[PDB]
Amino acid sequence: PGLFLTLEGLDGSGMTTQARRLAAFLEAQGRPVLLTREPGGGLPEVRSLLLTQELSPEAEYLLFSADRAEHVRKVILPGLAAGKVVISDRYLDSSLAYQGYGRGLPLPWLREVAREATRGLKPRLTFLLDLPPEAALLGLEFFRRVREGYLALARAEPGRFVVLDATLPEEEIARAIQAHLRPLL
Amino acid sequence: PGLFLTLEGLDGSGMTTQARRLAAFLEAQGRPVLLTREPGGGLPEVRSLLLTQELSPEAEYLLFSADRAEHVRKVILPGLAAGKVVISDRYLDSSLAYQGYGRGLPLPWLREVAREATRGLKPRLTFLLDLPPEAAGLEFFRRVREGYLALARAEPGRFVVLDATLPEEEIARAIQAHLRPLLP
Numbered sequence: 001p002g003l004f005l006t007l008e009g010l011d012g013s014g015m016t017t018q019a020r021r022l023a024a025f026l027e028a029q030g031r032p033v034l035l036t037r038e039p040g041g042g043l044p045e046v047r048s049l050l051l052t053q054e055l056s057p058e059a060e061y062l063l064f065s066a067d068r069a070e071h072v073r074k075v076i077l078p079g080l081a082a083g084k085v086v087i088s089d090r091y092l093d094s095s096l097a098y099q100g101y102g103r104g105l106p107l108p109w110l111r112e113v114a115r116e117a118t119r120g121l122k123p124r125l126t127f128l129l130d131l132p133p134e135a136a137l138l139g140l141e142f143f144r145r146v147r148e149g150y151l152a153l154a155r156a157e158p159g160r161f162v163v164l165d166a167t168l169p170e171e172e173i174a175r176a177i178q179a180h181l182r183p184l185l
Numbered sequence: 186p187g188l189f190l191t192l193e194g195l196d197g198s199g200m201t202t203q204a205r206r207l208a209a210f211l212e213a214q215g216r217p218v219l220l221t222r223e224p225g226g227g228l229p230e231v232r233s234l235l236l237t238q239e240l241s242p243e244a245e246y247l248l249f250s251a252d253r254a255e256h257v258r259k260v261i262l263p264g265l266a267a268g269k270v271v272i273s274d275r276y277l278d279s280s281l282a283y284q285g286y287g288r289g290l291p292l293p294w295l296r297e298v299a300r301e302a303t304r305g306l307k308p309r310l311t312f313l314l315d316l317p318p319e320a321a322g323l324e325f326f327r328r329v330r331e332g333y334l335a336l337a338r339a340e341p342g343r344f345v346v347l348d349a350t351l352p353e354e355e356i357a358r359a360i361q362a363h364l365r366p367l368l369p
Contacts, residue, residue, distance in 0.1 A: 043244065045234055058254040058301055059228060066234070066247035073241050105301070112297050116243055116290075 002080030003184060004121065006091040009129035010147060012167040014173060018129065019089045021174040026085050031185065034079040037089035042070030056129075057103035061110065064095050069117040076121065092118060093126060093153055101149025102142055124184060127177055128154050129166035141183030187265030188367060189306065194314035195321040195330055198349040203312065204274040206357045207364075211270050214368060218237065219264040222274035224248075227255030227349040242288035246295060249280050254302040261306065277303055278311060279335055286332020287325050295368035309367065312360050313337050 005022070007015040019035055026033040041048030046067040050060065068091075081088040094112050099105050128150055133143035154161035164173055164181045190207070194201040201222075208218045225232050231252035235245065253276070264271040277299050309369035313333055322344045337344035345363045347356055 016196065043234060043237060044239075045230075049234075053228070053230075055228070055251075056254055056258045058258070059251045062247050062251035062254055062298075062302065066244040069241055069244040069247055070237075073244075107302050109297070112294070113247075116294050117247060178304055 002083050004076065004080055004086045004087065004088075004123045005181070006093070006123040006126045007094045007129065008087045008090065008097070008126055008150060009166055010133060010136045010143060011133065013129035013131055014170060015089050015129055016129065017170060018173055018177060021098065021170075022177055023086055024176070025178055029185070032082070032084045034075070034084045034086045035089070036071070036075050036079075036086065038091060038094065039064055039067050039173075040072060041075050041088070042067040042072070045049050057105050060103070061095055061099040061105060061113070062093060064099070065113055065117045067090065068114075069094075072118050072121055079120070088123075091123060091126075092151070093128075097146045097149040102146040114150065123160065125180065126161050126182075128163045129173070130163050131166040135167050139159055174175050187268055187325065188270045189261065189273075189308045190264055191273045191278070191308040192312050192314065193275065193278045193282070193310045193314065193331075193333060194235060195316040195318065195326060196316035197321055198272055199315055199353060202353055203314065203360060204355055205273050206353070207272055207360055209239035210357070210361055210364075216368070217267075217269045219260070219269045220274075221256065221260055221264075221271065223256060223276060223279060224252050226233045226260055226273065227252040227257070242284050242290050245288070246280055246290055246298070248283040249284070250298050250302045253280075253299070257303050257306055262304070271369075273308070276308060276311070278313075278333070281336060282329050282332040286335070287304050287329040308343065309365060312363075313344050313346045314349040314356070315346055320349075 007019050009015050023033045023035045039050055043066060046063050050063060074090065096107060096110055097142050100107050100110050130151065133147060135142050154163050164176050192204050194200050204220060208220045211218045224235055228251060231248050234248050261271050281295055282293060285292050285295050315334065318330045337346050348358055
């Protein structure tokens with residue numbers, strides 16, 4: 001059957017740690033799991049470029065989208081087809097937050113592009129690890145737009161987003177995530 | 186105000202040669218010219234990623250679009266703003282023909298992606314060098330070749346369809362003939 005779960009938030013919100021703890025939880029339960037991430041899960045070279053290059057928001061988004069399109073087709077959908085729980089550390093909501101709310105691109109266009117890039121694939125649950133930019137493990141105005149952008153996305157889809165306080169101890173966050181996930185297993 | 190011109194067609198149709206000769210002709214008319222190309226005129230690294238093995242048509246198109254977005258923004262629009270004739274060896278019609286007609290991606294999606302990527306910028310004229318597909322698998326090239334001709338049928342004022350098998354000098358003179366009413 002397969003279950004698709006994502007993690008989202010600012011860099012340093014503990015997403016990689018929590019994706020690893022979630023994967024381990026599922027391993028403990030005997031449930032096959034695939035852990036993956038964006039950018040780079042589709043086209044690793046995109047990650048390397050976005051690291052080095054200054055690009056227009058449109059070009060940045062379109063590169064992210066290409067990576068995502070490959071990621072969905074070659075990694076995520078085949079994992080789900082095998083009945084795995086697939087966890088992605090970042091997915092489309094990251095582009096919406098950073099390129100949309102952060103860099104100002106219009107959301108309906110972002111979503112139209114994404115419609116064919118993702119083959120319409122949506123996470124069943126998305127865990128947003130919310131904190132102020134100053135708490136992540138001026139220049140801050142961008143990151144505040146992104147943080148508020150994520151909160152905006154979450155309030156628009158309360159049936160998909162679970163918003164957690166990312167400044168809580170690591171173990172407590174993991175237990176909150178497990179609690180939210182248990183009904184879906 | 187500038188003038189935006191493109192060349193299109195199958196690879197080996199002589200597009201690069203015609204782009205070059207066109208730039209020369211225009212400079213001889215005292216017109217400043219910017220000669221550019223896709224892929225690579227926006228993000229030269231897109232050429233490596235484009236060769237990625239078994240790349241999905243969607244990913245391929247999105248890669249071309251990223252380069253195209255940077256190309257329009259950083260090269261072509263600033264060129265036009267400076268009053269240059271900008272000639273691009275390939276532009277959006279390349280994606281529509283190859284990724285749309287060839288690889289089967291839906292045209293309306295290709296266009297909606299392109300709307301922001303290109304900021305609606307369209308060439309005044311596009312010279313389509315129509316080449317037999319066996320000269321460019323063959324089934325793919327036949328779709329692409331025919332796809333281009335469909336595009337040209339659909340926008341008959343913008344497209345100038347030329348026989349790629351004619352001598353270079355004849356093609357160049359035909360391009361020159363279509364351009365004279367846009368020059369003083």
